[PDB]
Amino acid sequence: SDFTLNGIKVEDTFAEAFDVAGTAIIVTNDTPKWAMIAATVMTGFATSVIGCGAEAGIDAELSPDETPDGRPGVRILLFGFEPNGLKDQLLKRVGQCILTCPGTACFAGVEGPTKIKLGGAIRYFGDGFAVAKRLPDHEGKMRRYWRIPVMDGEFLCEDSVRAVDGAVGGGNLLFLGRKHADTLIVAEIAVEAAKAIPGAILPFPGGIVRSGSKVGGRTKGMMASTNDAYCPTLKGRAGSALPPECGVVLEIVIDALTSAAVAESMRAALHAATEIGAQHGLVAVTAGNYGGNLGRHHYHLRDLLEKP
């Protein structure tokens, strides 16, 4: 039953992930500095879909070659429960975090089956002065963009953005370690490994979560409560799932446009953490599950053994 990876104990559990609506947008600016500013203000306040509006993250920085604009850009993902709630959140965030940022321009990030109106709705801030243009892109496909007049110039925004089907969120694996300062470093180099997978992001601050989201609760209609089992202050008593050597636990949550990306992002995090884990006191690695019946996708750590 016990599993050992790179000399560090790994529990024989699975990560319970859920099906989610996901979409991607490419935001470009004249400089990469302001491309990042625009994305950073858009991704903020988006660590969970249940409390925050959505789950947002920056997938990758784009060079002037990887972009339809020809200007340095940013590929930024957004996830939500329902395709309507996702549309509602994208409209709010693009409208007041992208449109407001100077010199920006919004394009559709990923290809998908369902359509989401973006430029066609922000066009109404133009007060009837906005115009629409249709142009074939570098691949040969006819795309429609809106031109909203603003103080700095024109905010060009593609009419529609596509939402990919089968985007998976909630894939997580948590680390148990002796000391906060050192074990944070283990998780830090763990998120750096996971970020690299295309189409996958980590919404929480720096990718790391310190509050253990537990389903249910002790009193009345608790929807979420802290995970008393993995709390170091509640050690020694029955119901604490961590050994006496452990003193700090940190969780890593991954969302991705494709299910395979969730598994590959977890695998890379699982390996990178254990390789350096012994040096910084990493005791063990487990995954968060809810019982098996809540979430469709199960990411067993036993399948993540193969090196990347």
Partner 1 sequence: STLRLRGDLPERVDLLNITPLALSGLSETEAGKLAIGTSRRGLTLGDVFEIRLDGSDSLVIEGGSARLDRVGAALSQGSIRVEGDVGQRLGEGMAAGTLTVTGSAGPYAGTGATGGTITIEGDAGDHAGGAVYAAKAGLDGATLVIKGAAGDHLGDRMRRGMILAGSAGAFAASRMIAGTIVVSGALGDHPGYGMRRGTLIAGSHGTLLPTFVETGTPDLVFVRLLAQSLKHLGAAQANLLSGTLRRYSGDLATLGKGELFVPAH
Rounded Cα–Cα distance for residues 132 and 124 (Å)? 12
State yes or no: residue 218 binds partner 1 (CB under 8 A): no
Residue 289 interacts with a second copy (CB under 8 A): yes or no: no
- Which stretches within 77-156 are classed as H helix? 83-93, 119-122
Burial classification of residue 279, based on how many CB atoms lie within 10 Å of its CB (0-12 exposed, 13-18 middle, 19 or more buried): exposed
- Contact between residue 117 and residue 157 where contact means Cβ atoms under 8 Å apart: no
Pick from 105, 163, 176, 191: which binds partner 1 (CB under 8 A)? 105
By beta-carbon proximity to partner 1, the closer residue of 242 and 287 is 242
- The helices-and-strands tally (H runs, E runs) of the chain is 5, 18
Going by the DSSP 8-state scheme, the letter that residue 138 receives in this structure is T
Ramachandran category for residue 177: left, alpha or beta (phi over 0 → left; psi -120 to 50 → alpha) = beta
Single-letter code of the amino acid located at 273: A
**Segment contacting partner 1 by CB under 8 A, of 72-80, 135-143, 167-175, 218-226:** 135-143
Site residues for partner 1, window 145-204 (CB under 8 A)?
145, 147, 153-154, 156, 180
Residue 156 lies near a second copy (rule: CB under 8 A): no
By CB under 5 A, residue 10 contacts K ion: no
CB of 30 to a second copy, least distance (A): 7
Residue 70 C-beta: closest distance to partner 1, Å: 5
Does 26 engage in binding with K ion (CB under 5 A)?
Answer: no
In the chain, where do the E strands start and end? 3-5, 8-10, 14-28, 55-62, 73-80, 105-108, 114-117, 131-136, 142-149, 154-158, 160-177, 200-201, 208-209, 213-215, 224-226, 248-256, 282-287, 297-300
Site membership for partner 1, residue 68 (CB under 8 A): yes
Does 70 interact with partner 1 (rule: CB under 8 A)? yes
In the shown chain, the binding pattern of residues 70 to 109 toward a second copy, with x for contact by CB under 8 A and - for none, equals: ----------------------xx-xxx-xxxxxx-----
Q: Which stretch binds a second copy (CB under 8 A): 105-113, 145-153, 265-273, 293-301?
A: 145-153
Among 138, 152, 236, 238, binds a second copy (CB under 8 A): 152
d(CA 111, CA 109) in angstroms, rounded, equals: 7
For residue 189, the partner it binds in K ion, partner 1, a second copy, none, with Cβ less than 5 to 8 A by kind, is: none
Judged by CB under 8 A, the residue of 4, 66, 96, 129 near partner 1 is 129
Selected binder of a second copy within 198, 206, 243, 308 (CB under 8 A) = 206
Q: Does 61 bind a second copy (CB under 8 A)?
A: no
Site for a second copy contains 174 (CB under 8 A): yes
Q: Does 221 bind a second copy (CB under 8 A)?
A: no
In terms of Cβ atoms closer than 10 Å to its own Cβ (0-12, 13-18, 19+), residue 286 is buried
For residues 127 and 58, the answer to whether their CB atoms sit within 8 Å is no
